[PDB]
Amino acid sequence: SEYLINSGEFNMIVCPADKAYYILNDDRASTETLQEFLDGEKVQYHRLKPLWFKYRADESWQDLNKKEYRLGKELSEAELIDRFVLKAFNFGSLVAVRDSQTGAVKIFKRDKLKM
Amino acid sequence: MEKYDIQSETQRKAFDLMPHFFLDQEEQANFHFMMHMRLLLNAPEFMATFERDLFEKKLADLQAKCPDLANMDCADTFIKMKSYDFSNMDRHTFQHMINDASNPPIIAKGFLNDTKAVQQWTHEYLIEHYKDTEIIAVGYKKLKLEKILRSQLDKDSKVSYYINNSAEIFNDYPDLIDEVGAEKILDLFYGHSANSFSQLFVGNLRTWGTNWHQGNDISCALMISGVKRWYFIDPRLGYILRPFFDGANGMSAKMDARLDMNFHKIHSPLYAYAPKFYVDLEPGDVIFFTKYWPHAVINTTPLQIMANMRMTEVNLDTMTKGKDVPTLMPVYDNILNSDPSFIKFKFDIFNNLG
Ligand SMILES: [Fe+3]
């Protein structure tokens, strides 16, 4: 699936499968790509710059209990990305979600679609 | 600039530097991801490497804009905040100022001057006249105010008392509202916010103050006795403090406000060169500040008395939660609104209003 995520004053499309996210602005390239995303048509991600989050493949951290975690052991990279995109973990940011196969779009925050 | 009281070239240069601290959209995306995970994973130093890399890149941005950045005096990067006369202040004008995200923390100078608290309240006065008053506190459920005040007045005393700011002292003791002049605050916020929490803070110098942190609600600090020096940075510079979470209601930072600015210059140069806003809160003064304004407090008098009121957005018509106030860090709304603990906490507040 592909996720329209709000980060305050701008939206981004996150594609976990491709490890790519695209920052949308008030420009033609963004509005046309967003239109394709929402309308269930083939999304032309080629006309936007692909970025990815700057967590290391070997991220290690301590929780407040001082318990030690390592990415790929205690938590998978797939599970970490889930915690930023899924309705269960980041509903405060989740504007809309698109099914990759069927191209079916669920819109949560209609007010956040036009930024 | 006109919203602050600049008194030197160094202070002016620090202020003009502020826009160059602001994170670009990609940096914001990574900051969002980091801070979201810092709460969700309960991991204060999640993506510490990115944060370190960001600080280095951001320092290079300052050095590019200011080639002789190394020469400016980091000790003189503190900018005095402007205070207002609330004599002719109406709730409608006040609520507009509160809702304006471009406005810094609002200081009402001598707003509580004609209250009984500001006129009469001292450690000595409170001990004899308020023997029955209990406050939510513990040594580092409820304890007698007299007991805490006596211990703070004793120089040989061992135990320091931590006072919980998640209390309702005005609910417990409604008579204190008019005494400290809290009804003036309720009047100003009527139809905008309801008073969720209230607490009376009494201290000596065994508690130096509070280190860098930020709130997720509207706060009102009512200065009754003694002086506290408040530090602030612009919410958009919050990231330089290395912010983290001890739960949704524990928005903390790792920057130590006590340290010499020339020591900070070595270890935390972004904080060292950043414009830091300060006010000396004197008896009768009230400071109002909105969400995600990082601040530190330093007790400057041997004894201090200060009342704190936390306000939550309401709709009188509906009775329910009011629309979230405009902010300079809307990303924190997204992070907190994703935490089920914080969501339940916010609904529990509204259940407790009824
Ligand atoms: Fe505070």
TrEMBL record, chain A:
The lineage of its organism: Bacteria, Pseudomonadati, Pseudomonadota, Gammaproteobacteria, Enterobacterales. It comes from the Bacteria. This is Uncharacterized protein. It comes from Serratia plymuthica.
UniProtKB/TrEMBL annotation, chain B:
Residues 101-308 form the Cupin-like domain. It comes from the Bacteria. Fe(3+) binds at residues 213, 295. One of its GO terms (molecular function) is metal ion binding. SUPFAM superfamilies: Clavaminate synthase-like. Transmembrane segments: none annotated. Signal peptide: none annotated. InterPro entries: Cupin_8 (IPR041667), JMJD6_ArgDemeth/LysHydrox (IPR050910). Keywords: Metal-binding. This is Cupin-like domain-containing protein. It comes from Serratia plymuthica. The gene is oocP.
